[PDB]
Amino acid sequence: KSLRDQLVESIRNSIARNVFFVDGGKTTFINSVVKSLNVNIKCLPTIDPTKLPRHEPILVTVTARLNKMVSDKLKGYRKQKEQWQNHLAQLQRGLHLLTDKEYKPEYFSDALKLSIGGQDLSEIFEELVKRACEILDCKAILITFDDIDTQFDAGWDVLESIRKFFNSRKLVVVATGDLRLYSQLIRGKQYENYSKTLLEQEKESVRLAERGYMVEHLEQQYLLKLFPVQKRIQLKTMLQLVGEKGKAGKEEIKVKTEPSMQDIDAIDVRQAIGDAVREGLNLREGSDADMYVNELLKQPVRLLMQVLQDFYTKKYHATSSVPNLLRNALYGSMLSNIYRAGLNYEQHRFGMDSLCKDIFTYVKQDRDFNTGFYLRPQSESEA
Amino acid sequence: KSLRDQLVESIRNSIARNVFFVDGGKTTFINSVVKSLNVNIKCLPTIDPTKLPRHEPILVTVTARLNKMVSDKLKGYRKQKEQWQNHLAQLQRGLHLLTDKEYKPEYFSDALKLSIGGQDLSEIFEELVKRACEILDCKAILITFDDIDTQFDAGWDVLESIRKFFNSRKLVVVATGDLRLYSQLIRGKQYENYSKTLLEQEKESVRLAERGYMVEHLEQQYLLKLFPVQKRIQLKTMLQLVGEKGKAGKEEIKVKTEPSMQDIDAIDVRQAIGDAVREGLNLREGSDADMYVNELLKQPVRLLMQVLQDFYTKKYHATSSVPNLLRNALYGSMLSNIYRAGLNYEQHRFGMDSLCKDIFTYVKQDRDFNTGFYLRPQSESEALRNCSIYLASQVSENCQGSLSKFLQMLLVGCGSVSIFNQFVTELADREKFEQLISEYVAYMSVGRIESASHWANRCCAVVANSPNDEKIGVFLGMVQLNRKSRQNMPEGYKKFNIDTENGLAKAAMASSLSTVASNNLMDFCSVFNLIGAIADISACRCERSAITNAFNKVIAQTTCIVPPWSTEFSDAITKVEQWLKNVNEIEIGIRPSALLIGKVWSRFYFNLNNVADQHKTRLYRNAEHGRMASQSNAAKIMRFNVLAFLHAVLVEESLYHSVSDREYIGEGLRLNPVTSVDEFEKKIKIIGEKLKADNKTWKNTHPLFFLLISCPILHPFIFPIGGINCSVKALNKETSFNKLIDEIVGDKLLSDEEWDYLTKFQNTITSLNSSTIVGASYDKDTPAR
Amino acid sequence: LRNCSIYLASQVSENCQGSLSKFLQMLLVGCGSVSIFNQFVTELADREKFEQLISEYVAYMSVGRIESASHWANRCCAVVANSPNDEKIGVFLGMVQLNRKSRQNMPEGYKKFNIDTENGLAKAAMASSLSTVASNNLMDFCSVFNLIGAIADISACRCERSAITNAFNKVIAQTTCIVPPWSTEFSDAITKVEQWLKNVNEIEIGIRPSALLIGKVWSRFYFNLNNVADQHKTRLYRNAEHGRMASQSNAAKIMRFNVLAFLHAVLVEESLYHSVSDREYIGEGLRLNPVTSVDEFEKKIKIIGEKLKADNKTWKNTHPLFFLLISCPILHPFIFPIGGINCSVKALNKETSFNKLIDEIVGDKLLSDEEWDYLTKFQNTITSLNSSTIVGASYDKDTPAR
């Protein structure tokens, strides 16, 4: 992408917070960036916070990956090393601070032997990063964090590590995900600070209202802090990568419907969807088919991938009822949505007795009751 | 800053509680102070309570930093040292007191060996500070605490350490943050002291009330204690550092927009914001742009920094749509605010279907429902005030360069708020009120409209299930025409028939037809549906065939339900095809604001009720032919409803359209054409010959009015049969009203030989005059003399 | 709350200091936003319901987010106009609801209200008080609050003459608003407002009011207002027009005394509770309000008038706010309107001697004798409100004997 060139190239002249955020594929784009960086900038292997050991601070993972990169370099082609070890061991023995149930006085003696005073892990990690940058022939080390949609608790550890430890020039951070998720995490953590019995005592509408405005201000400032607006990345969607109604279509990509498809017969991408929709909905080429296609192009890119692939593979199947094929693909792809709405789960009673009741249920939650039986995709919500 | 000189200099002569508090950049100011101190006062490195190890008392961090400063000094240039060690070790071994789950007796023996008695950590730390002051050649050691906005639990440890340990001359404390946060912390800690089962037992309103007053007194005394009022620091805001309206501006600072900006080209700071706001909101230099800038200057200084930097860097980008740039910057900067309000998160469905629903949601939480569609930043709260400017940017970007989308904004968004107030609020508890809104959205199609005419069709039903006072079919902006020929008429009064109307007059007339299917399937001739029709043939396409079915959608009898709470057109199409091309070339040069669109609606909506009242009580048996100012019929009402639109657009667009720097309308007393065209004949005209002395046309300036006045759909309603006043006095305007219109449109509207019949037929309505209106008894005659 | 009271008193004292516009603001938006709620909105209201009624009353009233004082007064007209009873006359608290449809059979010369027959400043003063409320009938109210709101809006515009021009056009223009969700030709007048605004500008800076003064000025004003709403209510006879007497009242006399009720309220409390002078010049006397005649107003000005001289003081240094208000061209047409002047041998001795005292304060002489003579049997004087019919007014009996 030219947008990944964006991210690389602004990162390049961003060192001559320092955190770049990407909305949203996220994983594929992050990996592309990691590569395009290989004017030197080191890049740690992408960290997936949802796949790490559970109770393991992000600082531990970052330091371990940095240790492997530094030792792999140090190995080829000793004076430098034990003084990398020095900071590694001292960072270690200073790492009880993150994990302890409480403070015990034996840790005072640990804080009085000797550039600020004490055992502040921020300083030790920043010298560790200075170590790594001197050793690796690099200035800044790109700590890149992967999306957290699966389990967004780990996002809090990521945010705290970014705030407290990765705040340094020798580090540039690229995080990705959905900013609503981080909003949620931060707001919940901000509510955590209010004292218990205060919350159970002051329960007038004014108190909840002002505490809401207040957790507002705090969460907003937190996010403007860790994720500067100027450093946030697009990651457009599909409909933006293709034409709207024929008056657009920057960098069309094409999809492949058949096995042979010698990179010339590939029937577009807007087409594949239009053709599935027109065949399986029996809709003609009116503005209504382009309608359904437009809505379906706005989908999470995986959902479109899976529906469009199931349909066409089973279609090859059928040719060694298209609406049956599209219906099966849509049932599987939108399965969580229909199971939300209370529509019929079973395939063995699709028939049409359950179809009418499904439409009535959909109309009931879509309200409407006037154009709802059209089944046009106009509703409040994705589901 | 001179204010940091303040803090340093009062601290300097404050030692010759002792805690200085700073409201709120806090971090930058604190660091500046730490420096300005380097008459000696030692200063510990600034402590950030949110970045310390978790379970670590503030005393530990303070003592460690003091130990490093003392040992770094002690190193250069032994008798003193082991007696610093003595206090360090004894403070240590006396530090189990802060951390223990409980007391164990082995600690008694620790408290009996030997200036007060025991192992009180306060004394040991105060001697440690005396140690450090003797060693370092200083009197007082500035323990400076950094802001805690991130995680304000640590503020409690800070407060307790200040109260119990840093209370000493050899220590001066500078804390910073927001005093509401510390209020919260202290109040919660005070409630902590009340016994459990007491709290679960005494739960009368009096008990909670007195315990509230009581935690009041305690928290207040705590804060007056730890943070003396005389020692609290300003830390002004941005708007105070710059001018209010040009009558201020102490120590202006300037921002830099471009990379080169050789420390002279820096275009101010108030300017950068004013220029972003005026470009991305399309707001002109009126008091409204300085408005938005004033509100945005009051923001947390980081938010302004980030929005103002994103906008201008991406602007450099664009020059190797400004409203798109400002909208993106505002969306990112105010992201938490909009995500609070429940507005659309996604960028991939910004469009304008979600824009109208966003405005309705904002108005719902801003209450108002009367000026809310203005999107002015006036709300209770920071969150909705931010959302207002973000939505203004959304409107400016989405409506830019589109006459269809302008009418959309105007109708769906603003009307979706006005209609609700005056015709749906009479029903509505909060649970019930929102659900009434929920259907009003669902029925109105707000957020999911197909077409503007569809909204207007549904608007007819909503408006038509409330009015009273003799039950006439003369509603807000419409006339309910009789469709059953079962009523005994005086004179030539009879039904309405679409077949006797011809060509464009029929097409214009049929666009306004609206059928509502409650139980009687009436038919309304409504101005909204005509406006909705115009929106639907404004962005179809270059085709002539596409215009054809665009007609057939709005021309055809459109029938809808009341809410759940009560060949022959050949030349007209070329003409609409004509005017659409005319719109297409030159609609792209239109940058409206939520202010302009809201104010055009305000005039239009107001002018509408004057027509709904003045012309209501003038439906006589001979009032037809509308020859006079005090005779009205179904044709005169509709003509002035159409004229009310065009006048509203002309006036506000002469005032609030960012295509021209100034008004061509003049400083005058501004009225609406209700029963005659005095005011409309006027303003066009006074603008008409000013444009020439200014060497301007109706094209370059006043685009929207020019496109609307030139619409063939509107022309039949402008000079209908029986809607033209025929007095010697009244004609001098109306004949001179015609000329001005022709001169703008570029083609001459009615032939004299068509003009003569009017004042003594295609493209002119000839059957609405004698169409009877429901409830109009039509039994009385016009007054004489 | 006791601490909050003194804090808010300090807020009022600081913010209203040196500003006649902000003084009227405090007075109207703040204090009125409380009284109006009591007497016209409490009849509806549970605590959950009560606060929500307040929440809309704030939201509709624009309390906390007002654009202009006239906007508040326009919304105040609707709130006041959805409760009164007892024969359903259009004589409300501080206002008159004028008929706008000429469909009613009149005795005598009674007819509509028309703004076109009024001229120059009289028109401008009259049109400022026009208020339209759009519930279902779009009536028109001539309200003292909107006139006070108008004065506030042309008190802090600026030094310009053009800025005053559109300041007029905002308050002059037909202002139309909804009921709450719970029911060329002005050339010389502008120079004059431009005149009086400069007069205000030099010397408004020397005005330091208190929550006590502002609250007490409102208390007198608000009280005087209901005496006018009752004494003049039951005096609308067919021949009560020309207002020649104390027991004959019309739409012009009611409004004049509503304006006089304001000016008297300011004069009295400001003689008592304004920190610009150490003492009162009003005297230890029994203190009444001008309701049906100007006995009390002719009085206090005067007793203050010649005390100021023995004390070597002027209406400038002492009693600033009253001096600025009495000198406002906007108010003058309502002071001596046609049919609002009592024409009894007894009653005139005050009113002719009421005129002199006013001229001597303002510094310019208000009406020419040859304008004064027509009054006591025309620009800068209201001549069309006398014969303007009021809704509900019987207008059938003329001064019922005994």
Author numbering:
A (entry chain A): 35 to 50, 69 to 76, 81 to 94, 102 to 140, 147 to 183, 190 to 395, 412 to 474
B (entry chain G): 35 to 50, 69 to 76, 81 to 94, 102 to 140, 147 to 183, 190 to 395, 412 to 519, 524 to 661, ...
C (entry chain F): 475 to 519, 524 to 661, 704 to 897, 910 to 934
Question: How do the authors describe this structure?
Answer:
To define the role of RdrA in phage defense, we used cryo-EM to determine a 2.5 Å structure of E. coli RdrA. The cryo-EM structure of RdrA reveals a heptameric assembly with two layers of interlocking protein domains. The top layer of the RdrA assembly contains seven N-terminal AAA+ ATPase domains with an active site formed between each pair of neighboring subunits. Extending from the N-terminal AAA+ domain, the RdrA C terminus is a largely α-helical lobe that interlocks around the assembly to form a flared bottom layer of the heptameric complex. In contrast to most closed-ring AAA+ proteins that form hexameric assemblies, RdrA is an atypical complex with 7 repeating subunits. RdrA also lacks a pre-sensor 1 beta-hairpin insertion common in many clades of AAA+ proteins, and instead contains two large insertions not associated with designated AAA+ clades. The first RdrA insertion occurs after strands β2 and β3 where a canonical single helix α2 is replaced with a four-helix bundle that forms a crown at the top of the heptameric complex (discussed further in Figure 4). The second RdrA insertion occurs after the sensor 1 motif and includes three helices between strands β4 and β5 that reach into the central channel of the heptamer. In contrast to the N-terminal AAA+ domain, the α-helical RdrA C terminus contains no detectable homology with other known structures. RdrA is an active ATPase in vitro that preferentially hydrolyzes ATP.
The RADAR system comprises two genes, rdrA that encodes a protein with an ATPase domain, and rdrB, encoding a predicted adenosine deaminase domain protein. Here, we determine cryo-EM structures of the RADAR defense complex, revealing RdrA as a heptameric, two-layered AAA+ ATPase and RdrB as a dodecameric, hollow complex with twelve surface-exposed deaminase active sites. RdrA and RdrB join to form a giant assembly up to 10 MDa, with RdrA docked as a funnel over the RdrB active site. Our results define ATP mononucleotide deamination as a determinant of RADAR immunity and reveal supramolecular assembly of a nucleotide-modifying machine as a mechanism of anti-phage defense.
